[PDB]
C-alpha cells in the first residue's frame, strides 16, 4: 500500500508547494552545515559528544541526523554514529540517554529515506509518509510506558506506525503532509541555526 500513500504525499506537495520547497531547502542547508563543518568523521564525533552532553536540542539532533545522512559516503559514517549512540545511550542516563537515543534512531531513519529515494524530491515525498508513521509510533509509546524507550523499542513502534501509515485514508496522509511541512519548517530553522553556532 506504499504506492497509494505516496500518491497522497504528492498531492500535499502540489497543494502546498511553497512550504514543501522550503522544507527541501532547509534539508539541503542542514547537509551543507554538516558537510562544511569539517570531515564527516569529525562532525559525527562532535555531534555525538554534544548530544551526549545535553547540548544539542531535539531540533538540532533532527537537523544533524539529516545532514549526516544526505551523503552516500556519509551514510556509512551515519550508521556508525547510530550504533555508537546506542552503545553510549545504554551507558548513559537522563538527557544523555534520551538525546543519544533520538540521534541513533534519526540517523538510521534518514539513511533509510536517503537510500530509498533517487533524488531530493523523492526524499521529500517518502519523508511525508514517515512523518505520519512517527506520530502513530509516538502515540504507541505514549499509550504504553512499558514500551522500550530503547532504540530497538522505538523502531518497532515506528515499523508498526509505518505499516498503519501505508493503509491510512487519503485525507489522513494529506493532512499529515501539511503538518510535516509546518513542523519541519520550524524544527529545521531552529535546528540549522543551532548546528551553525555549535559546529563552527
Ligand atoms: Na562533515
Author numbering: 1 to 200
Study authors write:
Here we present rotamer inverted fragment finder–diffusion (Riff-Diff), a hybrid machine learning and atomistic modelling strategy for scaffolding catalytic arrays in de novo proteins. We show that in both cases, it is possible to generate catalysts that exhibit activities rivalling those optimized by in vitro evolution, along with exquisite stereoselectivity. High-resolution structures of six of the designs revealed near-atomic active site design precision.
We obtained crystal structures of the four designs: RAD13 (kcat = 3.8 × 10−5 s−1), RAD17 (kcat not determined), RAD32 (kcat = 1.1 × 10−2 s−1), and RAD36 (kcat = 6.2 × 10−5 s−1). The crystal structures agree with the design models, having backbone Cα RMSD values between 0.68 Å and 1.2 Å. The catalytic residues of RAD13 and RAD17 adopted the correct conformation with heavy-atom sidechain RMSD values of 0.42 Å and 1.09 Å to the design model and 0.89 Å and 1.2 Å to the catalytic geometry, respectively. This indicates that precise positioning of catalytic sidechains is by itself not sufficient to design efficient biocatalysts, even when scaffolding catalytic arrays that are derived from highly active enzymes. RMSD is a popular metric for measuring how closely a designed active site aligns with the intended catalytic array, but it is agnostic to the geometric constraints of catalytic interactions. This could explain the discrepancy between the low RMSD in the active site of RAD13 and low catalytic activity and general poor predictiveness of sidechain RMSD for activity.
